[PDB]
Amino acid sequence: TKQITLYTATFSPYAHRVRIALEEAGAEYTTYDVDILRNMPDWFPLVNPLKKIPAMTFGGPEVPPDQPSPESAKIAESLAMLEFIADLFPDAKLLPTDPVLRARARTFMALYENYVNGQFRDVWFLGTPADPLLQALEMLQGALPPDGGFAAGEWSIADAAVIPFLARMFPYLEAGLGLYSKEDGVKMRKAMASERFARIRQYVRDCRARPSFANTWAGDAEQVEAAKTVPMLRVGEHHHH
C-alpha cells in the first residue's frame, strides 16, 4: 500500500533498470524526471544525498515529488532498488525460488557490474580501447544459458539490471555517439553483428520484446537524442590509441 516514487531521467540506464522491474512487478508507482546533469533542483539531496539518479522514496504521506516528505524511506543505488522491488512483490517472482538459480541471477549482475559496466563507461566517455569491452561482453555472453532464455532461465531482476546498457549499445553505435575512434566504432559495429555475438543479440531481442521494455523505452531515435544531452558526451571529440 505504501507509495513508491522513482526519480528518473530518460537518458539514464541506471534509472531504466528500476522502471523495468517496477513494470514486471505490476507495482503502482510515480515517476518524476530530474535534470540531474544540467540543473539539479535544490530539494533533490533530500531524496538522495549522493545527488544521483535514480532515487526512490517509499511510504510516508502522499506528497508531490518535488515536495518530498522527511517521513518517507529514501533508497539509493539501482541494484539495491531491484532487490527491494523483488522483496516487496514476492508473488511477481522477480527472482527464482531455487537458491542456485537465484545465485545465477546475482552472479550475472556482479559480472556485469564488475567487468562490463566500467568498460562501457570508459569506451563511451573516455574513448578507451574497444577490445577490452568486447572481451568483457563475450565473457558475459558466456554466462547466459546457451539454448535461449534469460540470465537465470526465467526472467529476473538480473535481466532488468543488464538490458538498459546492452539495448543502448546498438543505437548509440549506429548514431556515432561516444568519444572512441572511428576505427573502434567500425570494430564494435562489425563485432556486434558477427557470429561471435549471436547469443547476446538473441538475449537483447528477447529482453526488448517484453512489455516492461517497450513501456519504459522512448524509442531508439528518442533515446539517442536524450543521450546527446549528456555533457560528458562532448560532440566532435574523439580519442585515439
Ligand X SMILES: N[C@@H](CCC(=O)N[C@@H](CS)C(=O)NCC(=O)O)C(=O)O
Ligand Y SMILES: O=C(c1ccc(O)cc1)c1ccc(O)cc1O
Q: Of the two residues 115 and 165, which places its CB atom closer to ligand Y in the complex?
A: 165
Q: Say how far apart CA 64 and CA 88 lie, in whole Å.
A: 23
Rule CB under 5 A: choose which of 45, 49, 59, 142 binds Ca ion. 142
Rule CB under 8 A: choose which of 35, 87, 174, 222 binds a second copy. 87
Least distance to ligand X, CB of residue 223, Å: 13
Query: Of 3-11, 76-84, 119-127, 138-146, which part binds Ca ion (CB under 5 A)?
Result: 138-146
Q: Say how far apart CA 132 and CA 69 lie, in whole Å.
A: 44
Query: Per the structure block, which three cell numbers stand in for 43?
Result: 530539494
**Residues 141-180 contacting a second copy, CB under 8 A:** 142
Q: Are 41 and 18 in contact (CB under 8 A)?
A: no
Q: Which of ligand X, a second copy, ligand Y, none lies near 53, with the C-beta cut-off 5 to 8 A by kind?
A: ligand X
Least distance to a second copy, CB of residue 162, Å: 14
Q: Which of Ca ion, ligand X, ligand Y, none lies near 142, with the C-beta cut-off 5 to 8 A by kind?
A: Ca ion
**Residue owning grid cell 533498470:** 17
Q: What are phi and psi of 84, to 5 degrees?
A: -65, -45
For residue 88, give the 3-state DSSP assignment: helix
**Residue owning grid cell 522513482:** 6
76 binds ligand Y per the rule CB under 6 A: no
Indicate the residue type of 103.
A
> Helical H runs in 42-98?
44-47, 78-88
Query: Of 85-93, 104-112, 163-171, 180-188, which part binds ligand Y (CB under 6 A)?
Result: 163-171
Residues that bind Ca ion (CB under 5 A): 142
